[PDB]
Subunit: 218 residues, 4 copies
């Protein structure tokens, strides 16, 4: 019922034109939520937005390069004015002949910075919502990214709970049915029915055992 | 929709007259699921069953001492015949001047045995369901119990997946709104929408940080 | 130097005639420590004791069935009187057509009880030592055992630190050079040089990565 | 004996003039190891080097700004030529009105880059040693750093084992006797006696329990 309802909940999802982000927009839109998304390619955006309205989904978007400071500030200003200064959900969806050290550090930090900054640009809207929710949805490079994001997630959760802001991190499977099916866990975590769930770092992996001993991603 | 529907799903919940078990029966019954539960006290059972039918909940029960082998075998026989040899959900809900070694080992093992045996007595019904789901819902004594159950949970999940049987473990908060609110996570995990989620050991704790460093239950 | 010296440190090691226990006796004896061990087979004991004295190792032993209460009480009485009521180290080394529920619960609990009880029978000697050290050295059955012991280990460590008693758990590799080489980690953990190390649950596994993502035993 | 000997083992320790690094140089030098260290302040270096030679410690150093690419390349060239192209140990010791996003991402990534690059600049010397060893020794900012480094550590360990290169990460206590006492664990991990230990992420924390439930840093 009302506990499992996302109806009319305002959602900001970054990178909503593909992969997990697109699946997350669909999932939330399936629950009749109001979503704003973004993408660098204005053609793919309008392209996804079109297909969405033809499904009864209420989604708006903007051409933002989430890797740029002024872009993240503009995006959040566009979100506040359209949601009336209040934001219920924030889905920090990070984007995707061998990588060097500079590239390794550039990609891992850029991801963390973008995520850490967007969370700060959204705080006021989230806190004003009364039931704020944040979810960080994101080898070699990836793994180190995971470890980095899991910590930030749990750190924030241990810092904004009084403002009523919960934060959790979700990771796709490493071993398996689509990996994009994880969108339903993302949705549930943001439901009022999951208000007590915060600081969780969940990876929906197939998991495995050896001779009877468990083994899973870290 | 159908992905988040538990409608007409058959559920066996042990210890459903109190605490978490009672909350789990309510949660599943709220979703219009068909549940069978048990309890040693036939008065508390009929007492809970009465209040339930007056709420439109479809729950049946039996007086079982889940700590006794013949009782667990009788309980499962009562479940099969009433659900037609098929069982969708199994909620292994364990029950609750200082404890000695014998008592320490007696309580931790008794809990594990009961849970491990009930899972085996239910396998055929679960497998026959096509979408089997098991969830193990359960200081000093408790902690060691947790560690024990988490392993069994992940072990089974790494063993019955081919039969379509998923298994997860859920723990109540150590630090916080009722702890019984965790029933909604229990319900979601059993939904078709969460079919890809298995081998998870989740403790919905308030969590905490020190000087900025995270800290959570193990 | 003195920080990495185990010289004249009294050690109780259960099951010291084979596998890890025998390796642990050798390791500590290599550091010139005074050890007392036990075994059900009095022939294998005298057999190992003989070979040891011919190596300059100072080890004594007794025929104890560590699975029996009166045996554990007798063993510890034999240890106190020979070490003068003080014990520096305690190595809880647990011992090793498909297992049933009763056997599953009987083996996991028996292991935990024996370990939990021996730790209590040794407390006074450990505390009196001033620098007490305990290490719990121990599929399906095993994994659940691990989870159980890891918790007890960390629980005790969080309870006897004021008496100067540290406690850690060590597990052999699941995937690799002998697994018995872990005896050196066991020795180091008990050194004064490792006095600040407690509550650790270490499994020296070969570990592995998939497509770049880490994976290890739980 | 030889298994626990670090005698004549060549060691590169970054930031060896203070805190943990200085303690690590002392620990290894106590075992009569040959160490090369670095520091931005040439006065503090010569200052520490002086006090060291007056203790019989064999340590050399260079003024390197480990945060600069050309500096890390120069440092490693200075190490190879003095150790004859072979390096046994590599201790990646990272260095230390509220931080912003750019600073947050700049510090976490800079630390990871420096560590990831130094490991690559040392590989050939390590591999040529035959028994290569690497140890990464390193709120809010720190925690995320930890998560990042733990992953890289385990990733590398899962990549250079065939070359005989082991890698582990060690973290100081969050809650307690000096935190610099962890230098002995660092030394042990690099000993031949610990050749089978790799992929470990150890934090020597005091740990704690609540009502009997364990709780530790992640």
């Amino acid at each position: 019922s009302q506990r499992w309802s996302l109806k009319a909940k305002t959602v900001l999802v970054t990178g909503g034109t593909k992969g997990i982000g697109h699946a997350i927009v669909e999932e939330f839109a399936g629950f009749g939520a109001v979503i704003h998304t973004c993408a660098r390619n204005e053609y793919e955006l309008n392209e996804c937005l079109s297909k969405w309205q033809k499904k009864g989904f209420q989604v708006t978007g903007s051409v933002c390069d989430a890797s740029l400071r002024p872009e993240r500030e503009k995006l959040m200003q566009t979100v506040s004015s359209m949601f009336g200064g209040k934001l219920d959900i924030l889905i920090n969806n990070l984007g995707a002949l061998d990588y060097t050290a500079e590239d390794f550090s550039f990609h891992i930090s850029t991801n963390l910075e973008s995520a850490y900054h967007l969370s700060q640009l959204a705080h006021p809207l989230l806190k004003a919502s009364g039931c704020g929710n944040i979810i960080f949805m994101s080898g070699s490079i990836y793994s180190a990214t995971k470890g980095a994001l899991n910590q930030l997630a749990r750190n924030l959760a241990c810092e904004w709970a009084s403002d009523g802001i919960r934060a959790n991190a979700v990771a796709p499977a490493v071993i398996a049915g689509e990996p994009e099916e994880v969108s339903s866990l993302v949705a549930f975590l943001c439901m009022p029915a999951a208000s007590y769930i915060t600081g969780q770092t969940i990876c929906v992996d197939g998991g495995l055992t050896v001779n009877g001993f468990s083994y899973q991603p870290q």
